[model samples]
Target: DISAKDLRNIMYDHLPGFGTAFHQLVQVICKLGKDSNSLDIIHAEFQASLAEGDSPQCALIQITKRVPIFQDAAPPVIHIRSRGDIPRACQKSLRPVPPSPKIDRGWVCVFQLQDGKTLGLKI
Candidate 1:
């Protein structure tokens, strides 16, 4: 797990293209300089799930896996379903959703799959 101090380098040095957006997301969910406690907890939970066991370096790697941007060379495209119907294809490819998928309202999440490629939910 990274100390709050490390977030600076993790964002700027390691993750280049998406650093700013990631920090914005963090701020949306938690405080930045004052309270980034959730990141360490996120890493800890991931470490506990490992079969090969946990490594200190794996904290960032674990976080990276979930970010999709880092997990895949390109981030998966997102989908929205506002017609109040979940497509059968999206249902078939359904992956786990975050505990809270936040939005204003009247927004629904649906993930579709592509034949030769990974798609929304897998991201």
Candidate 2:
């Protein structure tokens, strides 16, 4: 009977991937219970983490450093309906959305660096 507040605390308390692992576990729980409705509050909080810019080192560093390029190139705004919705170039940096199954107004701002590396902001 973990609460959303507990999950929110966990997101920042542990190492980067712990939050993600918990996020996925919650997703699996929601899916397997056939109970998306039961955990919508918890799930939405997880999704809110992404929107609030809570991600691992690589994701933050890339987005922060490459902001100029993103703006210059008019970074493509991509909606993350599913894992498949992510672009191949930015796949490594961008993580999957939550298991809410409801399409978030997920704005994945993507752009390419001068060295051809791809970076993205999950805004």
Best by lDDT: 2
| Clash tally, candidates in order | 0, 0
Instruction: Give the Å error, residue 100, model 1.
Output: 9.5
lDDT of 1 by residue, 38-109 (tens): 655543444453545654334334554453323333222344443123334333434454443321111123
lDDT of each: 0.36, 0.38
Candidate 2's error at 57, in angstroms? 12
Q: Report the lDDT of model 2 for residue 61.
A: 29
Q: What does candidate 2's lDDT look like per residue over 12-112, in tens digits? A: 45334443423332323333223323344444444555577765333322332332322222224333444444334334545343332221222234334
Candidate of highest TM-score: 1
> Which pairs in model 1 have colliding backbones?
none
